[PDB]
């Protein structure tokens, strides 16, 4: 027999997980392979959470772990204690609603999988949308963190293939409320884009700069991610900005079903192999990982199952996701309405209406020429 534990938020989610695992067991042949699941709730103290999760799940000899973000607002502490504790061995952990760029460095987290587009897909879809707008004057504001640097690097490596000059870049630092010199730097330029990569409320600060440097209107479109249009940043924002957001975002039951289906497929694929051991139990008396640890992760990367709730749930080399979906809206007098549908190099935007943060409709052509020349010379009697 085998078991697949998980860490969920509420008891209703636990009941949904039980129903999903029962349905999965009802499927397939279920010959000599039974998977009864166990669940556990969250805790305020991270130390208590880590100790409890190891002593509970590890002692049960699980074969996979599912972790989801708790219902508490903001923050990102959801996977870090579980990922660190279960990262001692090579038991894979599946993410459910955790979209952060810190969990992409395989050197730090050596065993972590999820089915949610990191924020590299944010810059990828940014490049995909910008390839057709025909501006070639990319300038963006980036917060000095892991997410902002990752987004800027993804933009640079997306433009490296196209061989285009991305003007300049602005770095407004994290945790600041007085940013206007960067706005003056971006004031004089032929780059008519105000692409923004900030950290929530920080954007709000530079948003106030938009109300202070009077650059908004008849040009200077804005491009922000899903996290920049939530909270105060959404409230202290001007209309006409493109409300990019990731679409079935706050939905987990469908994601739970997809995860359990792909886990069952991977387990069935792995069962037909050579001798297989079991992960140790106790959290105390074992200091060695089992032999075929990374083998399960490797066979899990190459597991494709495009029949659960949505399209092809394909895992790339990084392990985040492939072929997901994106719904880019716009702040047209608030009430964001989807205008762009994205699924990977195959954008089919909605033709509802296009409005820019200048009260107009026509796309602001981002070009300036200037005939201001700056001759310089040294004196020379017959000529100068």
């Amino acid at each position, epitope marked *: 027999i085998v078991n697949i534990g998980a860490v969920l938020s509420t008891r209703k989610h636990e009941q949904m997980f039980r129903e999903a695992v029962n349905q999965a067991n009802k499927r397939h042949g279920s010959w000599k392979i039974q998977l009864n699941a166990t669940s556990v709730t969250h805790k305020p103290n991270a130390i208590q959470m880590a100790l409890s999760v190891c002593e509970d799940l590890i002692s049960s000899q699980v074969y996979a772990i599912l972790v989801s973000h708790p219902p508490t607002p903001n923050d990102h502490f959801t996977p870090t204690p579980v990922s660190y504790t279960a990262g001692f061995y090579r038991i894979p952990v599946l993410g459910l609603t955790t979209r952060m760029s810190i969990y992409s460095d395989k050197s730090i987290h050596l065993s972590f999988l999820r089915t949610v587009p990191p924020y590299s897909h944010q810059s990828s879809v940014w490049f995909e949308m910008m390839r057709v707008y025909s501006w070639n004057h990319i300038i963006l504001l980036v917060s000095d963190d892991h997410e902002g640097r990752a987004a800027q690097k993804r933009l640079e490596t997306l433009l490296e293939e196209r061989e285009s000059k991305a003007e300049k870049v602005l770095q407004f630092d994290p945790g600041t409320k007085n940013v206007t010199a960067l706005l003056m730097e971006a004031k004089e330029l032929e780059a008519r884009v105000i692409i923004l990569s900030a950290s929530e409320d920080d954007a709000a600060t530079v948003y106030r700069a938009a*109300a202070m440097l009077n650059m908004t209107g008849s040009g200077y479109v804005w491009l922000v991610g899903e996290r920049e249009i939530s*909270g*105060n940043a*959404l*409230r*202290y924002a*001007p209309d006409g900005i493109l409300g990019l957001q990731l679409i079935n975002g706050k939905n987990e039951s469908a994601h739970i079903s997809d995860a359990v289906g792909v886990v069952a497929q991977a387990v069935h694929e792995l069962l037909e192999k050579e001798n297989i051991t079991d992960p140790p139990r106790g959290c105390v008396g074992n200091t060695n990982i089992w032999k075929t640890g990374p083998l399960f992760k490797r066979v899990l990367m190459s597991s494709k199952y495009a029949d659960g709730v949505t399209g092809r749930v394909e895992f790339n080399e990084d392990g985040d996701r492939k072929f997901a979906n994106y719904s880019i809206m716009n702040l*047209q*007098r*608030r*009430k*964001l*309405v989807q205008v762009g549908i994205y699924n990977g190099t195959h954008v089919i935007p909605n033709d*509802r*209406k*296009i*409005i820019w943060p200048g*009260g*107009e*409709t026509e796309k602001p052509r981002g070009y300036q020429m200037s005939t201001r020349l700056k001759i310089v010379t040294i004196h020379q009697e017959p000529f100068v």
Partner: antibody, heavy 117, light 109 residues
Framework: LQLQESGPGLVKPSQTLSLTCTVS?????????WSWVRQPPGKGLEWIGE???????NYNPSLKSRVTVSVDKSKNQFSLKLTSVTAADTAVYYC?????????????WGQGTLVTV | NFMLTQPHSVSESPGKTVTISCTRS????????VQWYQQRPGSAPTTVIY?????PSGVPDRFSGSIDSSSNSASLTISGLKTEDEADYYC?????????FGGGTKLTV
């Protein structure tokens, strides 16, 4: 800019009202919206929809397939149509354009039109 | 979508301070803006408070508005009540889905 709202005057049961809110002293060609405020008798106030010249309009998620608003710039006019208006749709319609500012703000408020279905 | 709650009725002597509280049951009214309108009997409503920090030009300086920021409620304070203040007070707010208006409160002199 002033708004003069005159309705069809017919309030028979199972009918659709289309009030004409003419604009005097102003031009339709602008970046402003024009929203309708629905006031039931002896109750509160709610917003049922709005019109904006350059394209899409958001009436309401509750009655998206029930209220349709169109605008003609040449006549400086804009009309609404409530699809399948029930006998309980007897209220007062007010046409207020907008305030730009940074968020929605209805000012000034027109005299509106009165319908008793 | 959400709802806003207002007191049924209030009574205060003229020349005193009258406080009207409009509470938001769902969510938190701390980032988006709220406004206070006033309706006369038989006339179109007129705004009295916007942006919770100033008043429209020509409005009396007695009217003031503030946000509790603790109980998700907006407080409108009028000092020096007068007979001309007899009207209907409404609280209006907006969100990312729809725009809602308060039930309304009436003060009796």
């Amino acid at each position: 800019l002033q708004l003069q709202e005159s309705g069809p005057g017919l309030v028979k049961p199972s009918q659709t009202l289309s009030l004409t809110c003419t604009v005097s002293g102003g031009s339709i060609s602008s970046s402003n919206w024009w929203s309708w405020v629905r006031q039931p008798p002896g109750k509160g106030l709610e917003w049922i929809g709005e019109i904006y010249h350059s394209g899409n309009t958001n009436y309401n998620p509750s009655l998206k397939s029930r209220v349709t608003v169109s605008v003609d710039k040449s006549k400086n006019q804009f009309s609404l149509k409530l699809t399948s208006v029930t006998a309980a749709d007897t209220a007062v319609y007010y046409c207020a354009r907008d305030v730009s500012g940074g968020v929605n703000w209805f000012d000034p408020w027109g005299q509106g039109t009165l319908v008793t279905v | 979508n959400f709802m806003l709650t207002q007191p049924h009725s209030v009574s205060e002597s003229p020349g005193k301070t009258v406080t009207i509280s409009c509470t938001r049951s769902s969510g938190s009214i701390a980032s988006n803006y709220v406004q206070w309108y006033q309706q006369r009997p038989g006339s179109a409503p007129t705004t009295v408070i916007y942006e919770d920090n100033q008043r429209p030009s020509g409005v009396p300086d007695r009217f003031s508005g503030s946000i509790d920021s603790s109980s998700n409620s907006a407080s409108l304070t009028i000092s020096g009540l007068k007979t001309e203040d007899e009207a209907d007070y409404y609280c209006q707010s907006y969100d990312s889905s729809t725009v809602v208006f308060g039930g309304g409160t009436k003060l009796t002199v």
